[PDB]
From a paper:
Protein stability can be fine‐tuned by modifying different structural features such as hydrogen‐bond networks, salt bridges, hydrophobic cores, or disulfide bridges. Among these, stabilization by salt bridges is a major challenge in protein design and engineering since their stabilizing effects show a high dependence on the structural environment in the protein, and therefore are difficult to predict and model. In this work, we explore the effects on structure and stability of an introduced salt bridge cluster in the context of three different de novo [name] barrels. The results show that despite the similarities in protein fold, the salt bridge clusters differently influence the structural and stability properties of the de novo [name] barrel variants depending on the structural background where they are introduced.
The salt bridge variants exhibit similar thermostability in comparison with their parental designs but important differences in the conformational stability at 25°C can be observed such as a highly stabilizing effect for two of the proteins but a destabilizing effect to the third. Analysis of the formed geometries of the salt bridge cluster in the crystal structures show either highly ordered salt bridge clusters or only single salt bridges. Rosetta modeling of the salt bridge clusters results in a good prediction of the tendency on stability changes but not the geometries observed in the three‐dimensional structures.
Author numbering: 1 to 184
Write the structure that this text describes.
């Protein structure tokens, strides 16, 4: 998720010093509120190609300087690359499929690729292949801390934690995670 709850979360996280806050939502209304409220990255959820391109253009005309497009369909991500979306968020399931998806995106000139996976094995292979942002899907506070910490001493320079619970994201802020991804 709700607008007043997302604003409240963003405000609390910013008042705790979060320097990179992402707001994820399938509703254009929430994301426009987050931009106005100062959210750093707007994460456009998986939608149709026509609706994704229309939302990207208006977020950009409204002043979004960091737009992320999330999609499991590689067609959307390329069309968002071409439109100029800033972060391409790969939500793949198969390992060898992910590095395949990442490699074409990078050859096409994607300068900011994010890989999203609850499986730490995929995220490491993404770190190996040079993905720019590792998006950890959280579930347990001590499990996320473990994954964040291993990823960090593996050399991950940009770690994002995704959670719908303010508890996990504050722990990720406390632990030094780079991007806090407010789920809605
Ligand atoms: Cl995401």
């Amino acid at each position: 998720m709700d607008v007043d709850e997302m604003l409240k979360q963003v405000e609390i996280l910013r008042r705790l010093g979060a320097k990179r806050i992402a707001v994820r939502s399938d509703d254009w209304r929430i994301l426009q509120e987050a931009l106005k409220k100062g959210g750093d990255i707007l994460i456009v959820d998986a939608t149709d190609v026509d609706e994704m391109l229309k939302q990207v253009e208006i977020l950009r005309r409204l002043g979004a300087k960091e737009i992320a497009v999330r999609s499991d369909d590689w067609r959307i991500l390329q069309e968002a690359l071409k439109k100029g979306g800033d972060i391409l968020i790969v939500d793949a399931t198969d390992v060898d499929e992910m590095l395949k998806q990442v490699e074409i995106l990078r050859r096409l000139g994607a300068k900011r690729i994010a890989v999203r996976s609850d499986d730490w094995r995929i995220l490491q292979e993404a770190l190996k292949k040079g993905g720019d942002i590792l998006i950890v899907d959280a579930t347990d506070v001590d499990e996320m801390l473990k994954q964040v910490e291993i990823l960090r001493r593996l050399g991950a320079k940009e770690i994002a934690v995704r959670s719908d619970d303010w508890r996990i994201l504050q722990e990720a802020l406390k632990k030094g995670g780079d991007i806090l991804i407010v789920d809605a």
